[PDB]
Design a binder for this molecule. Structure first.
Ligand SMILES: [Ca+2]
Ligand SMILES: [Ca+2]
Lengths: 152, 152
DNA sequence: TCAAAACGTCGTGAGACAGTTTGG
DNA sequence: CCAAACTGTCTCACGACGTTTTGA
């Protein structure tokens, strides 16, 4: 359970507030009990020419990976528990995305208990609706209401 | 000469590397002796619904202003003296824009003598070139070479 | 003759999703 | 069934300039 140097977390929070994204999604998938997956992602996007900077992030955060999508690349951290640790430490230094971080950080602490009740799952899904409304969301399709319809 | 809190600078350096810009321009303007103005800008852009964040920067930096351009707003700092003080302190924490910051600092220092020798003015425009080269420059028109064709 | 502000827009470089597959 | 990875794309929200005017 890695501890990060404060000055790193201060800079990083500023960069995240700039080019970063804290993301929650409900993914339709028949193989799941409620026919949806709950997906959490922390990401930083950057021009591939500066991919080196994302690579440095992998090294410094000690987990996650970088992916290519042409002219641009992304640092991706989706593993639920390294994510909890990282976001716990980053959260108090964020300013634009501190609300997203804390929703995520609590959606995490209720996953063990949101696959039991279909109603609990609907509750958690509404929190991801919240994260999406805090972000500059423009192409969102699957929400906690395409879900509620399905749970019927 | 205000001395800025280091935690603030660390966060700001991350945010600058993210959504900020360090700009130097050679502006054709016939009322100047060498037919161009040397202009320097530090800026941070953010969509207007987030203007409060830019307003805070005005207060915390103690100088500069926010302008609106529709859906988006920019914190703007162009005054040469505050810019020098400010960049001197920010620069050590920058990771993507450090080179640009140092070149702006160099330009500022040479500006006085730059207005006296055409050759020295050219040197400076050369440094303007390096800055544009370091940024994601895509609409640039006036270059240190446009200046030579006029120093003639 | 200047520093600085004002006014304006091109071309992405991000952000924030989607859908689908892997593998335990 | 589930976490996580893999693969793709919509629509800006930025970045990084330009030209013109103000007021000393
Ligand atoms: Ca941003
Ligand atoms: Ca950026």
């Amino acid at each position: 359970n890695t501890k990060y140097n404060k000055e790193f977390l201060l800079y990083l929070a500023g960069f995240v507030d700039g080019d970063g994204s804290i993301i929650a999604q409900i993914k339709p998938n028949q193989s799941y009990k409620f026919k949806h997956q709950l997906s959490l992602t922390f990401q930083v996007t950057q021009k591939t020419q500066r991919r080196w900077f994302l690579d440095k992030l992998v090294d410094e955060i000690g987990v996650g990976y970088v992916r290519d999508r042409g002219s641009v690349s992304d640092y991706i951290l989706s593993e639920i528990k390294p994510l909890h640790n990282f976001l716990t430490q980053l959260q108090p230094f964020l300013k634009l995305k501190q609300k997203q971080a804390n929703l995520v950080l609590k959606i995490i602490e209720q996953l063990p208990s949101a696959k039991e009740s279909p109603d609990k799952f609907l509750e958690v899904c509404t929190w991801v609706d919240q994260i999406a409304a805090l972000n500059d969301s423009k192409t969102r399709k699957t929400t906690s209401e395409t879900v509620r319809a399905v749970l019927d």
